[PDB]
């Protein structure tokens, strides 16, 4: 077959009922994730190839970066709660991996302040139980598949993208194959 279980994707041994249609996991510490976001724009190109109004979900993980990694999962919860993902994703990646100016929870907060989120609003969200529940949701979703590597994408709780089996000579062709694979999986 043109798409084969074991090649462009794998099938979850223990499938996850009731999971988001398209679910991505990343870490701001993760070098491929940096590329997926700023260089390849994987999430954007998958959304364009899926039906309008499809639920795409993107969650941060704790297992890279120790204390700061957990702070970033909580900061990503704040980003989701306020709806400012599109404003902080690039500066968070660059602060962790490019300039390495993010060394503390305060430095993460600075990124939100610079992006125009008011300090009182960031702090209220950071301390909110709505954000605690978003953190729990991110952890539970990752736990549902004993996740140990990012970046990772899951389709309907059943299939995991396998980018290792895609040609990487041409960035655009790679992105297109990845997105076309997500579309194929979503239609299974």
Ligand X SMILES: c1cc(-c2ccc(CNC3CCCCC3)cc2)cs1
Q: How far is the CB of 35 from ligand X (least distance, A)?
A: 6
Give CA angle at 43 (39, 48), nearest 5°: 110
> What is the C-alpha to C-alpha distance for residues 134 and 77, in angstroms, rounded to an integer?
5
With contacts defined by CB under 6 A, name the span among 3-11, 91-99, 131-139, 161-169 that binds ligand X.
Answer: 161-169
Number of residues that bind ligand X (CB under 6 A): 9
Which one among 1, 52, 164, 187 touches ligand X, defined by CB under 6 A? 164
Instruction: Confirm if 181 and 161 have CB atoms less than 8 A apart.
Output: yes
Which one among 113, 130, 143, 171 touches ligand X, defined by CB under 6 A? 171
> What is the C-alpha to C-alpha distance for residues 177 and 137, in angstroms, rounded to an integer?
30
91 near ligand X (CB under 6 A): no
DSSP string for 49-111: HSPTT--EEEEE-SSSSHHHHHHHHHHHHHHHHHT-HHHHHHHHHIIIIIS----SHHHHHHH
- Between residue 120 and residue 159, which ones bind ligand X under the rule CB under 6 A? 149, 151
Which residues on neighbouring strands pair with residue 161, listed in sequence order? 9
- Between residue 22 and residue 61, which ones bind ligand X under the rule CB under 6 A? 32, 35
With contacts defined by CB under 6 A, name the span among 11-19, 111-119, 136-144, 162-170 that binds ligand X.
Answer: 162-170
Q: How far is the CB of 171 from ligand X (least distance, A)?
A: 4
Binding site for ligand X (CB under 6 A): 32, 35, 149, 151, 163-164, 168, 171, 174
């Amino acid at each position: 077959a043109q798409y084969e279980d074991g090649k462009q994707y794998t099938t979850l041994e223990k499938p996850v009922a009731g999971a988001p249609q398209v679910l991505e996991f990343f870490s701001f510490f993760c070098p491929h994730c940096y590329q997926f976001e700023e260089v390849l724009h994987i999430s954007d190109n998958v959304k364009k190839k899926l039906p309008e109004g499809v639920k795409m979900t993107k969650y941060h993980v704790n297992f890279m970066g120790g204390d700061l990694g957990k702070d970033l999962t909580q900061a990503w919860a704040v980003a989701m709660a306020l709806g400012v993902e599109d404003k902080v994703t690039v500066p968070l990646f660059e602060g962790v991996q490019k300039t390495q100016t993010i060394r503390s929870a305060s430095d993460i907060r600075d990124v939100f302040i610079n992006a125009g989120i008011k300090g009182e609003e960031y702090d209220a969200a950071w301390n909110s139980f709505v954000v605690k529940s978003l953190v729990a949701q991110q952890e539970k979703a990752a736990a549902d598949v004993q996740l140990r590597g990012v970046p990772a994408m899951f389709v309907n709780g059943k299939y995991q993208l396998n980018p290792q089996g895609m040609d990487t000579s041409n960035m655009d062709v790679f992105v297109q194959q990845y997105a076309d694979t997500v579309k194929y999986l979503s239609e299974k």
